[PDB]
Amino acid sequence: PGLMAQMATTAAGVAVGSAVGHVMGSALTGAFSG
Amino acid sequence: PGLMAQMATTAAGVAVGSAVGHVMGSALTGAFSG
Amino acid sequence: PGLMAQMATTAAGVAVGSAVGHVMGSALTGAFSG
Amino acid sequence: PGLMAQMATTAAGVAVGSAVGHVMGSALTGAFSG
Amino acid sequence: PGLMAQMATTAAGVAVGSAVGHVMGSALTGAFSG
Amino acid sequence: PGLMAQMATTAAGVAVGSAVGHVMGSALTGAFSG
């Protein structure tokens, strides 16, 4: 395989190119648990 | 295979190119659990 | 295969190019569970 | 005023949660010209 | 004013949570010209 | 004013949480010209 990817992404309180007065973010990730 | 991808994406409180007074975000991810 | 993708996407409280007074978002994802 | 926003947004070739073979996009913006 | 925002946003060839074979994007912005 | 923002944002060939085979992007910005 040219590219194999198993990705677990978590995003909270993300501002991209924005005019935001206040940002709050809480993120939790549990991945690849045996 | 040229590209194999197993992706689990979680987004909360995301502002993109926006004028937001206040942003709140809470995100949780559980992936690839055995 | 040129591109194989198994994607689980969750979005909550997303503002794109918007004028929003207040944004609330809660997202949870469970994927690829054995 | 609580929130005053003058926004000029341009989007071309945008794929959101989609399975697209090929995407082409050309965008131009002229804003707030004196 | 609590929040004053003059925003000029340009997006081309944007893929969000998508399985895309190929993405092409060309974006140009002219803003706040005197 | 609590927050004054004059923003000129340009995005091309942006992939967010996506499985993309190939991404091409060309972006140009001209802002705040006298």
- F3 to chain B, closest Cα gap in Å: 10
Closest by Cα among D21, B21, D32, A31 to F6: D32
Chain E residues near residue C7 by CB distance under 8 angstroms: 17, 19
Put simply, whether C9 touches E (Cβ < 8 Å) is yes
Does the CB of D31 have a partner CB in chain C at under 8 Å?
no
**Rounded Cα distance, E25 and C24, in Å:** 31
The phi, psi pair for F2, rounded to 5°, reads: -65, -40
CB < 8 Å to B8, chain A:
7-9, 31
**Are residues A11 and B10 in contact, defined by beta-carbon separation less than 8 angstroms?**
yes
Give the residue from D32, D27, D25 showing the smallest Cα distance to D8: D32
Q: F17 contacts in C (CB within 8 Å)?
A: 7, 9
Find the CB nearest D6 among E2, E6, E30.
Answer: E6
Q: What is the DSSP letter of A26?
A: E
Tokens of A20: 């935001």
The set of chains that have 3 or more CB pairs under 8 A with B is A, C, D, E, F
A2 reaches F (C-beta below 8 A): no
SS3 content of chain A, % helix, strand, coil (to 5): 0, 70, 30
| Other C-beta atoms lying within 10 Å of the C-beta of residue A34 | 5
In whole angstroms, what is the distance from residue F10 CA to residue F28 CA?
7
How many residues make up chain E in this entry? 34
Q: Does F6 touch chain B (CB under 8 A)?
A: no
